[PDB]
Amino acid sequence: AELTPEVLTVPLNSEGKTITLTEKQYLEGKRLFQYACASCHVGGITKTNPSLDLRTETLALATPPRDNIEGLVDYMKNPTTYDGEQEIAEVHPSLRSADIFPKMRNLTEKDLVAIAGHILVEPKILGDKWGGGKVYY
Amino acid sequence: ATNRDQESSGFAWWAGNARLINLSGKLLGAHVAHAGLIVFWAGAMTLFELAHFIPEKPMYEQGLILIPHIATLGWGVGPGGEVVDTFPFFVVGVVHLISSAVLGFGGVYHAIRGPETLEEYSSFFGYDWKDKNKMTTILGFHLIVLGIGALLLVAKAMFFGGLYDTWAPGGGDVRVITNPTLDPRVIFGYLLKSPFGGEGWIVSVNNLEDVVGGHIWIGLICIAGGIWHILTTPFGWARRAFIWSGEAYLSYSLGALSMMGFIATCFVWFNNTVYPSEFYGPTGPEASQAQAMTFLIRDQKLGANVGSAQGPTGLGKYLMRSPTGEIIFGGETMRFWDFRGPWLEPLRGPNGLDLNKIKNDIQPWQERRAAEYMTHAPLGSLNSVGGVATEINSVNFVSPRSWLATSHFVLAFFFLVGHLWHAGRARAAAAGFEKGIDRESEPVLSMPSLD
Amino acid sequence: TTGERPFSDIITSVRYWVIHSITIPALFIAGWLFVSTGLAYDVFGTPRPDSYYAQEQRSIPLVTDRFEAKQQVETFLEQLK
Amino acid sequence: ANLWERFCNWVTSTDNRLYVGWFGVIMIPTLLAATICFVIAFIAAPPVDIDGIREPVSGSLLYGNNIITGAVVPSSNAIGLHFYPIWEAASLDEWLYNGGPYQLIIFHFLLGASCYMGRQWELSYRLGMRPWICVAYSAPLASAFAVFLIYPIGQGSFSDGMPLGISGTFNFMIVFQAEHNILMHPFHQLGVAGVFGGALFCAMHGSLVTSSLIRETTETESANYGYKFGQEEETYNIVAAHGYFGRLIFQYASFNNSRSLHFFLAAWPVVGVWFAALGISTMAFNLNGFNFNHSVIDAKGNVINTWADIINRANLGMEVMHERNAHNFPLDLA
Amino acid sequence: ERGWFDILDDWLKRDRFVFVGWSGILLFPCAYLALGGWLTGTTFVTSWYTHGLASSYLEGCNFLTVAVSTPANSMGHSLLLLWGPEAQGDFTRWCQLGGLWTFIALHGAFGLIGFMLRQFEIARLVGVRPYNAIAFSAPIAVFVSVFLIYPLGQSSWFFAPSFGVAAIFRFLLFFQGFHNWTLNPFHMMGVAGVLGGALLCAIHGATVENTLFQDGEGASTFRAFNPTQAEETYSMVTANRFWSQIFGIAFSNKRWLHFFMLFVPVTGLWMSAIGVVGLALNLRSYDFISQEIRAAEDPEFETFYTKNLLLNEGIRAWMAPQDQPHENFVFPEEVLPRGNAL
Amino acid sequence: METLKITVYIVVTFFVLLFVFGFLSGDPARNPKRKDLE
Ligand code: CLA
Ligand code: CLA
Ligand code: CLA
Ligand code: CLA
Ligand code: CLA
Ligand SMILES: CC1=C(/C=C/C(C)=C/C=C/C(C)=C/C=C/C=C(C)/C=C/C=C(C)/C=C/C2=C(C)CCCC2(C)C)C(C)(C)CCC1
Ligand SMILES: CC1=C(/C=C/C(C)=C/C=C/C(C)=C/C=C/C=C(C)/C=C/C=C(C)/C=C/C2=C(C)CCCC2(C)C)C(C)(C)CCC1
Ligand SMILES: CC1=C(/C=C/C(C)=C/C=C/C(C)=C/C=C/C=C(C)/C=C/C=C(C)/C=C/C2=C(C)CCCC2(C)C)C(C)(C)CCC1
Ligand SMILES: CCCCCCCCCCCCO[C@@H]1O[C@H](CO)[C@@H](O[C@H]2O[C@H](CO)[C@@H](O)[C@H](O)[C@H]2O)[C@H](O)[C@H]1O
Ligand SMILES: [Ca+2]
Ligand SMILES: [Cl-]
Ligand SMILES: [Cl-]
Ligand SMILES: [Fe+2]
């Protein structure tokens, strides 16, 4: 098995446009995810709130949908609760809250795309392991 | 080659440094060269830390143990422990590194070039281990030096910028200490606290006024005793109780260092005042309490009445009573209810955690701080996979508190072994049987049989 | 002593090092090339990183018969496209 | 000859059947207290709420235990590291419920055993011996400190101290593997080499000396009567032993110096057990064994399992089942 | 009669740097091949087709995780000869099917026989009693019971220990979860023998070193000993008085002392071997029936015995699907035993 | 419980003093060889 362009092709937006990441983007997304996100999200779960995971099926049913690049990039700028009703920048890392989450200060727009691409590609590789927790270790 | 082989000295090569016992000049060289190594490491390690340091990451995510020591003293940091200026870290490293060349130079000179013995050269720098007067005088000088060192910390705190105060109103900040605690009932009352849970002996010091005032007392005490030991000679009761020899003196210091290493191990594990969690990461108690707080907050936001939620055991799922009645966090963290920290004390009332404050006054910065500390608990593998032993690879993390506590327990243990080794040997050498039993004089042969 | 030349004699002799300054690196380089040419994989039947699985499968090619085990492995190897 | 000097001369006398000495003055009462409490508690103590969840565990013989399952149960998790002498309880019945006896036993035992180590130094001084037998005893002594005191301190509770029982020991070991992966820690591995090697060199030295006993007896009598207590001459031929063992391996792999041979016999297990003690003592601060979970990844990024991942599955099973009612939140952080 | 047999005997028994002997004809090829097979396998050979595991340096494993793994369960107890009906002479297939495991195990068994014959042979030539060989029966009993008898009682070689560090750790944990092996009194005796032997090693070595006679002037006491001296180098009388007054009892017979040091670890290993023979048949010390009857009926009855069985139950359910891939266990999340929260 | 506490405090203090005064009582000289150690 190989990391092919098929694997690296993910939804860009809700209208069905796709974008194909490079292997360098994917690996950059993994490094930046570890840098800024894995302390709570290792393996696609959420340690401080295990009810919400990073499975694509879970992201598809968020409001607004987060199962694509634009939704995930928007989440990292201005995160909301699962139903979209509330803005949680004050307790979740984002560009809007880079003053209180200093690791977000040196993330650029290009970095957000790569992190987003990692989150969308990893389940295509790991299957149930992604967001499955210890049962699938 | 004076005393530089086994036949002349009686010591094999693997005990070669024992050949130095009565060669004060080379022994001086060895000690000065070695201090140069200590100062070298401090300087070089700091520079390595600085080169590898990203100011946007918490120190505790970066494998730093020296910069946190400097930051705690009030250099380079501002409110909340944010790094505002890395130049002080640079200075501290460079100056230690440059100084190590001076110490290395003197050490190499005295070790191989200078006079091997100092008694012929200078009666002031010369010494005999058995001269109780000279030994207490040398001890007296070094007590005065140590006492000055303690007063430098006071001067830093009161006159040269202050100290980083994790408890400062508004999130932690550098603060000048204007009223150090001088009341000896407070300062010495720390020494008589039990070392067990909820008391914690001196590890429990929780405010900078006590820290600074304790160093004033220690500075004076060391200077006074240093003068005392210059002017006096050991009394008769002391003379009869001790062994007076180089190895014996070494053994006493090994005992002392082992004890200090064990205390340092607990200090860094439990204390979050002189080891601020901003720089070192949360303590183990702290991260465990932070998890209870995180899920209390999450569930209360979902509509749970956390005060009346009965857990599976019948004890409260979120809150319960300590054995003396205080309201505390539930679950396995019941063991950690003695934890105090700036992010938690606003919820504390006279009876412990206050349900009204919990319901109404939890600020977003507290939720942030608890989620950060819960996810940087001091658990991790030897290859620096952060988390419980069953976690997958992803997070490269081992808390500085674990690094500092494990290393100093190991060092303290071996220094206790060294004390036993050298105290037992000093006693035997003084009495004259450290090389074996004299066949013609075997003591047990002159004793009555046991039965 | 048992008659053989002492080891300390041999390994401080120029002739020993004239010989072994060649034979030691030559063996090392042969071992390096055994891997770098990919020959080790084929001698022993060890998967390369891209041959543990087919592109979309997640099942192990586990041997399940005693006397057709050889053919089972060959069949698993075909199915790698 | 005043009464204090008389007392000191009796205390330090080399003529007592059992040496007392100054360490013995602390040793004797603390070991007696710990022994008496242990025996009574092992037989008759009521169940103990070890994990603080009002779920008492029965440890004594009268309450349904045999020799293998019985234990003196660690004190309650609700107490953590607080000091719990009898006089801090409102009654003996409270003290028993909360595992009071555990604290009394281990504190008196650790004091008594530290003084046992001092007593070994002390008698060697009175007899004109070299001083370091007590340094060998520091290795088992450090190990007891590791499981009764140091590990409780790092984890914040004497309830995670080792129970004083056979099956209690096994419980402690299994949970330790789940929470620290001790099998993958090099200090436990050095400890295994210490005690495996200690047992190997024990049988080795025993077999070699026994193999080279000098014929002094007939076949109908025990060869042990060929040695006489106090005799001046060695009872075996070390040259024949060295000649056998040097040929078994090669000549330079064998000892012909009895003094360095016996030093090696002392050092190997003592150093290994030191490392074992330090493993427990440093995993007390959660610096755990090597973690290679999902370390091997294929070209696509599939996880390729190693034996390390199979170990992890076993550790998870121990993790999720231990103390099954004691955790309300998803991470077992202590 | 000085025929070829006696001339060969002459050459085999020459006093050389490495003694050879008749025993050496068995010992050296078998020991060399078992070691060479382990190094070859841990460096280059996979366990993908037998276990679903990477297991070689080539694949990225390290010293702790490499192994030569057991064959697949479907091989049964096949000798797995290179020329046998499974591999059929194909060296690559043989490696993939687990032929290196039986190769190492069988050459290792015969190497161990050869080492023990070497101990007899050299002892007979030098003129010493053969107690070193007798003591070596204990490592042989352990090797044969764990690597041969145990899997022969089970379904296949697959359940034997695999030859690697972490693979052996998995073997320890399997024995706790499935066999409750810590509860077994034959293991308990083995533990006593091994820890007691380590204890005797430490205490005897320390006692000799601290009752030495001053037989020289140096502070390094090692030089003051001559292998041909007739005198004891340490005081048995002083040693005996020390331990009598510290511990109550002491050795007084030096021959008994060194026989005892042989006896204790050798007997311990032999006892552990017997219990493992029982486990070959699943004849475990798993339960105490009296405890189970009480606990079934009285849901307030809890002991460290019942606590450990719950741990075993966790080990079995959580490790079995990955550890026994040929069984095809599919355990949905909802059937997995778990405590609260974890 | 208070009587128990005072008793233990007194007992422990008694044995500790014996230990300290014991080793203060010329202990280096209590060996079979050289007494003159001071
Ligand atoms: C911190 C570690 C340390 C220090 C400071 C010393 C110091 C000393 N050792 Mg000890 N020793 C040590 C560790 C140390 N040792 C260790 C680990 C072992 C076991 C191997 C020994 C075993 C041992 C034996 C057997 C002996 C000593 C002896 C000595 C003394 C004389 C050495 C000599 O004459 O060499 C001469 C060597 C040289 C001239 C070669 C180079 C030496 C220089 C100093 C190298 C320094 C390089 C440095 C980069 C230059 C910086 C210059 C710059 C600052 C300007 C000296 C005071 C001797 C002694 O006791 O004499 C009475 C002796 O016989 N040692
Ligand atoms: C300030 C601390 C201190 C000082 C000044 C001394 C001084 C001395 N010791 Mg003592 N000792 C100490 C602490 C100290 N010791 C401790 C903490 C222990 C317990 C381990 C000992 C145990 C001990 C024993 C058993 C003996 C001494 C002896 C001696 C004398 C000869 C030392 C020598 O030449 O070693 C030479 C140095 C070496 C041979 C090198 C040792 C190498 C170490 C083990 C490597 C450790 C690994 C390292 C930390 C990390 C790995 C590095 C690697 C990756 C490169 C000398 C008076 C001897 C004596 O009694 O003489 C009177 C003796 O027999 N010491
Ligand atoms: C007080 C001692 C101490 C402590 C607590 C730390 C802690 C740390 N170091 Mg530092 N460091 C130290 C001393 C220390 N160091 C010394 C002496 C050096 C010079 C060698 C360094 C040079 C250094 C570098 C270059 C780096 C670190 C790094 C780190 C971090 C990662 C450590 C790691 O992964 O270890 C791995 C674990 C081991 C190697 C285990 C060592 C096992 C030893 C050999 C056992 C010894 C036992 C005993 C001493 C011997 C007894 C023998 C017996 C016979 C008596 C961690 C914060 C890393 C970092 O993150 O920097 C920001 C990094 O890159 N350190
Ligand atoms: C504590 C360490 C120490 C001690 C006790 C000594 C002691 C001695 N040295 Mg050595 N030396 C040392 C370290 C030490 N030195 C260092 C670090 C170096 C490199 C600079 C040297 C280089 C050196 C040389 C080249 C010579 C000596 C000589 C001597 C002898 C005569 C010195 C004298 O009379 O000065 C009189 C006192 C003074 C001049 C006062 C000096 C005040 C200093 C420089 C200012 C700082 C004081 C302050 C406390 C420093 C704090 C440092 C701290 C932060 C680390 C004497 C035995 C001489 C000798 O061996 O004769 C044969 C000699 O020729 N030393
Ligand atoms: C490095 C520090 C240091 C060292 C090595 C010494 C060493 C010495 N001092 Mg000096 N002293 C010092 C600092 C030091 N002093 C300081 C800072 C002062 C000013 C306060 C003094 C004031 C002083 C006086 C007035 C006297 C000495 C004396 C002595 C000599 C006898 C020591 C003795 O018997 O202790 C043994 C300790 C005791 C007997 C204390 C009682 C025993 C208790 C019960 C032990 C408790 C241990 C326990 C674990 C404590 C844990 C912490 C605790 C606080 C809770 C010895 C040479 C004596 C001497 O001969 O002077 C010429 C003497 O009369 N010293
Ligand atoms: C005696 C003896 C010994 C020891 C020795 C020693 C221990 C020595 C020491 C030494 C030392 C201790 C030395 C040091 C030196 C130092 C130096 C030489 C430094 C320099 C520095 C510099 C040059 C700097 C630079 C810089 C800067 C300024 C800035 C930043 C960057 C950099 C870093 C580049 C031995 C054991 C061997 C043996 C024999 C005898
Ligand atoms: C700084 C500080 C502080 C303070 C501190 C202090 C004030 C301290 C003190 C300390 C001290 C003050 C200590 C002491 C110690 C002591 C010791 C450690 C002792 C010892 C002793 C000994 C060891 C003895 C011995 C012996 C005996 C017993 C018998 C006879 C003989 C002899 C002598 C051997 C505080 C906490 C506030 C806060 C923080 C900071
Ligand atoms: C199987 C087989 C065979 C055989 C083969 C062989 C015989 C091989 C050999 C092989 C070998 C013979 C190999 C070897 C290798 C080696 C190595 C790989 C080593 C390494 C080492 C190291 C790495 C080291 C390390 C260390 C230590 C351990 C300690 C000290 C320090 C150090 C760090 C140095 C035949 C063909 C018959 C047939 C088919 C099957
Ligand atoms: C809480 C701990 C308090 C520790 C207090 C430390 C204070 C130090 C003062 C110690 C008092 C000096 O008094 C000390 O005791 C008595 C006095 O009868 C003597 O006691 C001893 O003397 C000699 C020592 O050579 C012995 O042979 C003899 O058996 C014994 O009588 C000590 O030699 C003396 O040194
Ligand atoms: Ca003086
Ligand atoms: Cl449990
Ligand atoms: Cl919990
Ligand atoms: Fe012996």
PDB file of N, CA, C and O in Angstrom, chain D residues 239-261:
ATOM      1  N   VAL D 239      42.861 -24.353  42.270  1.00  0.00           N
ATOM      2  CA  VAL D 239      43.613 -24.482  41.023  1.00  0.00           C
ATOM      3  C   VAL D 239      42.954 -25.508  40.112  1.00  0.00           C
ATOM      4  O   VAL D 239      42.844 -25.300  38.897  1.00  0.00           O
ATOM      5  N   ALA D 240      42.494 -26.624  40.685  1.00  0.00           N
ATOM      6  CA  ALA D 240      41.726 -27.599  39.915  1.00  0.00           C
ATOM      7  C   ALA D 240      40.395 -27.017  39.437  1.00  0.00           C
ATOM      8  O   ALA D 240      39.950 -27.313  38.320  1.00  0.00           O
ATOM      9  N   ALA D 241      39.749 -26.181  40.256  1.00  0.00           N
ATOM     10  CA  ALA D 241      38.507 -25.548  39.816  1.00  0.00           C
ATOM     11  C   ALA D 241      38.767 -24.605  38.647  1.00  0.00           C
ATOM     12  O   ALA D 241      38.072 -24.644  37.624  1.00  0.00           O
ATOM     13  N   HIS D 242      39.774 -23.744  38.787  1.00  0.00           N
ATOM     14  CA  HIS D 242      40.135 -22.835  37.707  1.00  0.00           C
ATOM     15  C   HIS D 242      40.553 -23.607  36.459  1.00  0.00           C
ATOM     16  O   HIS D 242      40.244 -23.195  35.333  1.00  0.00           O
ATOM     17  N   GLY D 243      41.228 -24.747  36.644  1.00  0.00           N
ATOM     18  CA  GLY D 243      41.634 -25.560  35.507  1.00  0.00           C
ATOM     19  C   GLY D 243      40.462 -26.179  34.769  1.00  0.00           C
ATOM     20  O   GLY D 243      40.464 -26.257  33.538  1.00  0.00           O
ATOM     21  N   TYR D 244      39.447 -26.634  35.510  1.00  0.00           N
ATOM     22  CA  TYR D 244      38.220 -27.107  34.877  1.00  0.00           C
ATOM     23  C   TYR D 244      37.485 -25.968  34.173  1.00  0.00           C
ATOM     24  O   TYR D 244      37.138 -26.070  32.987  1.00  0.00           O
ATOM     25  N   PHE D 245      37.226 -24.871  34.894  1.00  0.00           N
ATOM     26  CA  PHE D 245      36.346 -23.843  34.347  1.00  0.00           C
ATOM     27  C   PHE D 245      37.029 -23.041  33.250  1.00  0.00           C
ATOM     28  O   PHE D 245      36.365 -22.592  32.303  1.00  0.00           O
ATOM     29  N   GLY D 246      38.344 -22.840  33.359  1.00  0.00           N
ATOM     30  CA  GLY D 246      39.074 -22.229  32.262  1.00  0.00           C
ATOM     31  C   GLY D 246      39.005 -23.049  30.989  1.00  0.00           C
ATOM     32  O   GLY D 246      38.968 -22.497  29.892  1.00  0.00           O
ATOM     33  N   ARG D 247      38.968 -24.376  31.108  1.00  0.00           N
ATOM     34  CA  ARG D 247      38.844 -25.181  29.899  1.00  0.00           C
ATOM     35  C   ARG D 247      37.409 -25.248  29.403  1.00  0.00           C
ATOM     36  O   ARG D 247      37.190 -25.404  28.195  1.00  0.00           O
ATOM     37  N   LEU D 248      36.432 -25.115  30.311  1.00  0.00           N
ATOM     38  CA  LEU D 248      35.026 -25.105  29.911  1.00  0.00           C
ATOM     39  C   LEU D 248      34.730 -23.947  28.972  1.00  0.00           C
ATOM     40  O   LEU D 248      33.995 -24.108  27.989  1.00  0.00           O
ATOM     41  N   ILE D 249      35.287 -22.769  29.264  1.00  0.00           N
ATOM     42  CA  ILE D 249      35.151 -21.594  28.411  1.00  0.00           C
ATOM     43  C   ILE D 249      36.502 -21.346  27.751  1.00  0.00           C
ATOM     44  O   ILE D 249      36.881 -22.042  26.803  1.00  0.00           O
ATOM     45  N   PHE D 250      37.241 -20.358  28.243  1.00  0.00           N
ATOM     46  CA  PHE D 250      38.661 -20.254  27.950  1.00  0.00           C
ATOM     47  C   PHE D 250      39.354 -19.720  29.196  1.00  0.00           C
ATOM     48  O   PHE D 250      38.714 -19.197  30.114  1.00  0.00           O
ATOM     49  N   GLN D 251      40.680 -19.879  29.217  1.00  0.00           N
ATOM     50  CA  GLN D 251      41.463 -19.696  30.439  1.00  0.00           C
ATOM     51  C   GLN D 251      41.241 -18.327  31.077  1.00  0.00           C
ATOM     52  O   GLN D 251      41.211 -18.204  32.308  1.00  0.00           O
ATOM     53  N   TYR D 252      41.090 -17.288  30.262  1.00  0.00           N
ATOM     54  CA  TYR D 252      40.998 -15.922  30.759  1.00  0.00           C
ATOM     55  C   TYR D 252      39.571 -15.512  31.110  1.00  0.00           C
ATOM     56  O   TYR D 252      39.356 -14.381  31.561  1.00  0.00           O
ATOM     57  N   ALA D 253      38.601 -16.404  30.932  1.00  0.00           N
ATOM     58  CA  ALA D 253      37.239 -16.177  31.389  1.00  0.00           C
ATOM     59  C   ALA D 253      37.011 -16.718  32.794  1.00  0.00           C
ATOM     60  O   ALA D 253      35.882 -16.682  33.292  1.00  0.00           O
ATOM     61  N   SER D 254      38.061 -17.219  33.439  1.00  0.00           N
ATOM     62  CA  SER D 254      37.954 -17.889  34.724  1.00  0.00           C
ATOM     63  C   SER D 254      38.715 -17.106  35.787  1.00  0.00           C
ATOM     64  O   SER D 254      39.682 -16.402  35.489  1.00  0.00           O
ATOM     65  N   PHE D 255      38.254 -17.213  37.027  1.00  0.00           N
ATOM     66  CA  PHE D 255      38.905 -16.563  38.154  1.00  0.00           C
ATOM     67  C   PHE D 255      39.854 -17.552  38.812  1.00  0.00           C
ATOM     68  O   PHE D 255      39.480 -18.698  39.074  1.00  0.00           O
ATOM     69  N   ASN D 256      41.074 -17.115  39.099  1.00  0.00           N
ATOM     70  CA  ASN D 256      41.919 -17.894  39.990  1.00  0.00           C
ATOM     71  C   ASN D 256      42.207 -17.157  41.288  1.00  0.00           C
ATOM     72  O   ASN D 256      42.861 -17.713  42.175  1.00  0.00           O
ATOM     73  N   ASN D 257      41.722 -15.930  41.422  1.00  0.00           N
ATOM     74  CA  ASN D 257      41.873 -15.146  42.639  1.00  0.00           C
ATOM     75  C   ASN D 257      40.546 -15.221  43.394  1.00  0.00           C
ATOM     76  O   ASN D 257      39.549 -14.618  42.981  1.00  0.00           O
ATOM     77  N   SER D 258      40.543 -15.972  44.497  1.00  0.00           N
ATOM     78  CA  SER D 258      39.333 -16.152  45.287  1.00  0.00           C
ATOM     79  C   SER D 258      38.775 -14.818  45.771  1.00  0.00           C
ATOM     80  O   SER D 258      37.554 -14.670  45.918  1.00  0.00           O
ATOM     81  N   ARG D 259      39.637 -13.824  45.989  1.00  0.00           N
ATOM     82  CA  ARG D 259      39.145 -12.548  46.499  1.00  0.00           C
ATOM     83  C   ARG D 259      38.368 -11.782  45.438  1.00  0.00           C
ATOM     84  O   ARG D 259      37.305 -11.214  45.726  1.00  0.00           O
ATOM     85  N   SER D 260      38.859 -11.755  44.205  1.00  0.00           N
ATOM     86  CA  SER D 260      38.095 -11.014  43.213  1.00  0.00           C
ATOM     87  C   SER D 260      36.884 -11.811  42.744  1.00  0.00           C
ATOM     88  O   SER D 260      35.852 -11.222  42.413  1.00  0.00           O
ATOM     89  N   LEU D 261      36.983 -13.141  42.745  1.00  0.00           N
ATOM     90  CA  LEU D 261      35.817 -13.983  42.504  1.00  0.00           C
ATOM     91  C   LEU D 261      34.698 -13.658  43.487  1.00  0.00           C
ATOM     92  O   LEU D 261      33.552 -13.418  43.091  1.00  0.00           O
TER      93      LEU D 261
END
